[PDB]
Predict the structure.
Amino acid sequence: SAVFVPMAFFGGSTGAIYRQFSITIVSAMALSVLVALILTPALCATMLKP
Amino acid sequence: VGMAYLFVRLPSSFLPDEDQGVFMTMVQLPAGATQERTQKVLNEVTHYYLTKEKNNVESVFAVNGFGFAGRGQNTGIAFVSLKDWADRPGEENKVEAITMRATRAFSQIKDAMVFAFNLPAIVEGFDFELIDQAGLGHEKLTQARNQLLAEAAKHPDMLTSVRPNGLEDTPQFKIDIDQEKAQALGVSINDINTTLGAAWGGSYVNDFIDRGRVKKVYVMSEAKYRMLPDDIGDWYVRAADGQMVPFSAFSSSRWEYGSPRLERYNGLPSMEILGQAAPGKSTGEAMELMEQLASKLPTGVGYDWTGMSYQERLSGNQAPSLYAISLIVVFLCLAALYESWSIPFSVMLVVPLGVIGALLAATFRGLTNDVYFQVGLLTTIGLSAKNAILIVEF
Amino acid sequence: GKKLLEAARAGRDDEVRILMANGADVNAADVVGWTPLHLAAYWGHLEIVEVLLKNGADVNAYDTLGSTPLHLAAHFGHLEIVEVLLKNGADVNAKDDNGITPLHLAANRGHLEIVEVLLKYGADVNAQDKFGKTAFDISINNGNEDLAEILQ
Amino acid sequence: GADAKTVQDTVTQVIEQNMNGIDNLMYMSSNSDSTGTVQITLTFESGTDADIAQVQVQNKLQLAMPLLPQEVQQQGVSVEKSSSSFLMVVGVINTDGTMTQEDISDYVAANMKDAISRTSGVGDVQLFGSQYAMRIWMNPNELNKFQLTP
Amino acid sequence: LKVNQDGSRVLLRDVAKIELGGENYDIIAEFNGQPASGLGIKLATGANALDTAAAIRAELAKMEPFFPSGLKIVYPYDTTPFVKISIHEVVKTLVEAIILVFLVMYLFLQNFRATLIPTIAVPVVLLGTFAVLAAFGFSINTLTMFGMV
Amino acid sequence: DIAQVQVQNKLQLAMPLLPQEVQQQGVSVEKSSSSFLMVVGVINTDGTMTQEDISDYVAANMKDAISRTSGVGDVQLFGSQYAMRIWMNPNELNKFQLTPVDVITAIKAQNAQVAAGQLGGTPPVKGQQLNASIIAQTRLTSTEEFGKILLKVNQDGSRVLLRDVAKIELGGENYDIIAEFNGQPASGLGIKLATGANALDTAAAIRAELAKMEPFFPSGLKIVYPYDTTPFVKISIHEVVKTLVEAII
Amino acid sequence: GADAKTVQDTVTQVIEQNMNGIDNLMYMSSNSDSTGTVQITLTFESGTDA
């Protein structure tokens, strides 16, 4: 997030366009972490074979 | 340093100019050009599409009289649909090529500017203005631009194509109403000027109802009686003694030139200019040369940038600043877990390792440093960051 | 081939030179009647005029309405051009359809030098336009003391 | 029926000069062509609601309106918050030929175009033709014969 | 127009020529070489594009039953199917990506059971993103949707 | 913003009941705070320009720009933009048997800009080659040109021109506002704020708006800043920042 | 003093036709009674600042 949230900071229509990506992947990634942090351990703990 | 070089050499676009399945064509005729002639040219273009690119074009919709520069008899435009992408595989069957061939053919058409293009990935190079600051007047600003464009021409290296966006001065017909005569013959100047206008320009009288719906009532001369300069005299106006007078009696005419499409920029007279940086060269330098080319012109003439040119002023490159803050907020935010001095730096070294492939894989498929390549970079570095992080952390 | 018209239009003296020397019609007339001499005498380019006159371009050529290049030069204050056209045999009393002479016309837009040159080459300071005004008359009515006193 | 200089000086200027104290404008391009038409685009510092941007502009258009000629204001003057690029274009045609071009244009204008024009997101629907009008075509000789003028 | 001195009348049709016609005669359009008119439709800044067109086919869908004989609509210039297709293509890249992931997962963990785990977790993330970027006022556009691949 | 629209759109509930003379003079709705953020004057150093010259100049080529810039409510101009001024004499008029009405009528008639149409205009008779605009009359541009307006031809033939019975000069639209700087003559831009505006930022824009002007000034003409809120605030924050540092010490 | 047809054709229509490119309207009812009065209500997609 510290590499690409800054790219939301470009002004102009250039940055207008950069905004979409810049945030869309931080959103996608941050939840990606929160879900991987909640769901995946659960699902690992329960569905894997010993 | 391989990265630094391969980076600094790679070209930079905005977005890919994609096959939008549709495109557009420009038909622009010379001075004093008439509707009929334009209609000819439009038919030549339409012909091309319908006959020669049967395989691609799906339908041409073309209009005489609706310029995108703006209206005229001497302007037309063809909206082109294409056949589906499925039903035309191959570059040769893709928009860019189609436009190329199209243009190539239309170049053959004498006595017209016709070319065809795709509308850029932004549905809604430079745009340079030239302002009449000190009130020098249209023919002097004409001269100012003539001098500027034909002195720019002397820099093929620096600037590739410097053209005016407007229409050029064109013949127009001056009538001078002898006031003294008008008064002598007892014919009112209102009656005169109205007669002229209504006959030749047309006049909106009042409204009528046409099948339940209000529309205009226009009075105007039959075509044949307003098609030529000598037709001017044929019109009579009634004087106070009930006696008819011809326009010849109290008018006088002569030909002159003048612009059929004046312009102003921020309330002051201006004339607009288009051009772009020559192959290999940055917009910024092209603009700088134009900036100093302007300085050697008559006094009262100044300049301003608009639109895209105006934008590139606010900022064009902040990447080295905001990637710098990206680099520090990254230098420290990693240590916010490694709780270590300089340990993040180790992960940091790997950042160029990733971008090398990205950079070359663009350069070999001949692609460009664009928004997509940028966001690409961010994702790739972030991934190789993850991989290196997990290694050093373990 | 009649690009010569627009050669006179846009200036470009040396392209007029290329074109005149490979055989383009030097008297070619456009949709308004205006020849390259008319065009030059309007947009005030001497050298174009020379390259045109010496090659024997009609000097008393007229457009619709009968306006001479001497008319055009006379109005716009192209004092340099009017002298060269005059030395090349330009009819000084030539009349557009409306009765206007180059003298009248110069007399109306306040060029004192050109009214002189026209009078030196033997203009008629009595020629009457369709409304019957003399060059003198259109000075009184302009409030110009100088032309009136000159045009005695 | 107005030339470009007329339409510059009598309309375009009496509008520009009345453009003051409106928010956020970057500039004011202004073409004034000889077909008797004016178009003045004001472009605003990006991210500024078009709605109010618009009101400021048109209400001072009405600071200017009573100085523009009768002929032009009765023809109307419009302020539109429009992007520059046709989202689509729909045509109509007669298959039989039983309808000339001007018929089609009218039809669209008179019973299609008002509806489509109202719908939201729509800046200015351009009509590729004209709605009808009662047209009186005048003859100078016949008029003179009876001793009449336009 | 006037009654003559002798009594006779001059009517407007006697000295003028009356017909129904265009308000202007400058704009002449033609489609596929046969004569036509149309609606060039612009956008109002800030408008929703596909939604506007979606409204326009609506606005227009009510018209045909009252058309005169022989009159038919046609769509020579249309941005939308580009965007329907632009999102069709990305959605299909996404699915086939989920496939390919599941293959590299099987080929590495070599068990049907194991491979269910990471597979299930991806959709949850990716649609989850619609939720959050909806809540920041961002649209499911060409750019955004393309970003999520 | 909306406060404003509600007001002015019902100003246009009222507009067609106000006299022609007042609406043609215009009526304005402005969302203005009450207090000049600054005032900038101009003067000629040489004296080669009278007061009304300065006023015009500012109005005609400075004031439109500064007026457009945001945060700006109503720029007050300390003088007037020029106008063609006809100064009338009752005796001379009477002599020729004329009223101000005949002068006014004549000016409207002979200083007109007339729509005249086109040669070859659509819809045209097929085979037309020439398509051209007709020019009729243009607004007059000069005292001289207004001079030669024709009021009437006398019974004997002779003409009465406007300059024969009136007196024409370029002058202020009003002559009420006379400004002066340091005892030498001047005009200026009294600039107000538009409510909600950002003050320093507005001024920051105003020095910008104005910084582009000087190269096209006539000889002898120079700007000057007799009333300016900003350096108070630059200093007000300078002082606090320095108290902060020395406090940290 | 105007009849309903007059007030329909001379006022009401020259207003309706000029209703274009305004946001969010659901429809435009329009009574035109013979007492020389027009009333045209435009109703807007609910929750759209008046």
Observations:
- Helices of chain D lie at 4-16, 50-64, 70-73, 101-118, 140-146.
- Chain D touches chain G at residues 51, 76, 80, 114, 117-118, 120, 122-125 (CB under 8 Å).
